[PDB]
């Protein structure tokens, strides 16, 4: 079956513009990132500060920001959780959803920063909103029934040994909440002709979940046949950015090959699962294998690879520009 939205290839001019990172932008990205490079375990003050920073940053860009807050039982007793949902144009029927988790693992060995997991993805989402704000605010005025939505899930991490009951607290909660929140096309602005909308879940046109990003030379694959048409756009954008000489590599004439033009057979537990179960299309931008530093005390700022981050930011900016025709 074809993708429901006809995917217009990004014009050369727009590819080149989205693939430019100024010195200012690097500074802006890193300043944003600094806010997330702190331990932010559920229940903590720094976690509350990170949540408030996400909310403030997006309200400042005139996005609609909602907090889905609830208390949930855990192996460590009742804990407070708050998903942050930011929507550029709430009334637009369909959403391109980008997502990540903002909580950090409570690591028994010691203080855990979770730089790839997922401080970098958090900063990448905010950086996208900030750096594309002008074009996004113009797109919002079109009445075309499509918008951008950012979801920062809380409580993705297990408190003790991973289980279905001890993990994905925020995403399980939100998926249920949105499934039970009924709506229809006539209540919404410009749904696509043959859309089947019965609840808020159905308005998630695709969810692009970023996780474990920031390490050198990640390998992505298409995890879901459902979203192969969208995944192939990431492969294409990456290829075009290399053709254009806009990727940072250690030597001339090398190319990035992050997005493999292949599928892989693997099952990863992450925030997409509760939405996958309600047939939300998923693109899971997570490396395979996981970064070497995964769930170790070395998942910290200095083990980040800045040229990779810059390259990923270009791909993501170009992807959002392509999808939303910015």
From Swiss-Prot:
Transmembrane segments: none annotated. Disruption phenotype: RNAi-mediated knockdown results in reduced enzymatic activity in midgut and salivary gland tissue extracts. Weight gain after feeding is reduced. Females lay very small eggs which fail to hatch into larvae. Induction: Strongly up-regulated in salivary gland during blood-feeding on the host. Peak expression is detected 48 hours after feeding begins. It holds the Pfam family Peptidase_M28. It comes from the Eukaryota. Strongly inhibited by PBD150, 1-benzylimidazole and N-omega-acetylhistamine, in a Zn(2+)-independent manner. Keywords: Acyltransferase, Disulfide bond, Glycoprotein, Metal-binding, Secreted, Signal, Transferase, Zinc. It catalyses: N-terminal L-glutaminyl-[peptide] = N-terminal 5-oxo-L-prolyl-[peptide] + NH4(+). Disulfide bonds join 69-82, 93-191, 100-122. GO terms for molecular function: glutaminyl-peptide cyclotransferase activity; zinc ion binding. Its EC number is 2.3.2.5. Changing residue 117 to A: Significantly impairs catalytic activity. The active site is at 156 (proton acceptor), 211 (proton acceptor). InterPro entries: M28_QC, Peptidase_M28, QC/QCL. Detected in salivary gland and midgut. Glycans are attached at residues 30, 261. One of its GO terms (cellular component) is extracellular region. Belongs to the glutaminyl-peptide cyclotransferase family. Responsible for the biosynthesis of pyroglutamyl peptides. Seems to have a preference for substrates with neutral or hydrophobic amino-acid residues at the second and third positions. This is Glutaminyl-peptide cyclotransferase. The lineage of its organism: Eukaryota, Metazoa, Ecdysozoa, Arthropoda, Chelicerata. The gene is Qptc.
């Amino acid at each position: 079956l074809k993708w429901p939205r006809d995917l217009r290839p990004l014009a050369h001019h727009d590819l080149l513009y989205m693939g430019q990172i100024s010195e200012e932008d690097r500074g802006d990205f890193n300043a944003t990132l600094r806010n997330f490079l702190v331990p932010r375990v559920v229940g903590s003050q720094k976690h509350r500060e990170v949540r408030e920073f996400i909310v403030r940053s997006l309200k400042d860009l005139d996005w609609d920001v909602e907090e889905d807050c609830f208390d949930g039982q855990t192996p460590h007793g009742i804990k407070p959780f708050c998903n942050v949902i930011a929507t550029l144009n709430p009334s637009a029927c369909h959403r391109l959803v980008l997502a990540c988790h903002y909580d950090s693992l409570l690591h028994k060995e010691g203080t855990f920063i979770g730089a790839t997991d997922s401080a970098v993805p958090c900063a990448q989402l905010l950086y996208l909103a900030r750096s594309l704000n002008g074009k996004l605010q113009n797109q919002k005025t079109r009445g075309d029934g499509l918008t951008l939505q950012l979801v920062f899930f809380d409580g993705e991490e297990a408190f003790e040994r991973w289980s279905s009951h001890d993990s994905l607290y925020g995403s399980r909660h939100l998926a249920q909440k949105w499934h039970e929140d009924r709506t229809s096309a006539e209540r919404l602005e410009s749904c696509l002709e043959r859309s089947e909308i019965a609840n808020q879940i159905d308005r998630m046109e695709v969810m692009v979940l970023l996780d474990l990003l920031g390490a050198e030379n990640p390998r992505f694959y298409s995890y879901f046949g459902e979203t192969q048409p969208v995944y192939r756009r990431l492969v294409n954008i990456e290829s075009r950015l290399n053709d254009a000489g806009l990727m940072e590599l250690p030597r001339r004439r090398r190319r990035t090959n992050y997005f493999s033009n292949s599928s892989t057979v693997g099952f990863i537990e992450d925030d997409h699962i509760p939405f996958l179960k309600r047939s939300v299309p998923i693109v899971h931008i997570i490396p395979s294998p996981f970064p070497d530093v995964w769930h170790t005390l070395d998942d910290n700022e200095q083990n980040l690879h800045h040229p990779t981050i810059s390259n990923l930011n270009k791909i993501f900016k170009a992807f959002v520009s392509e999808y939303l025709q910015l």
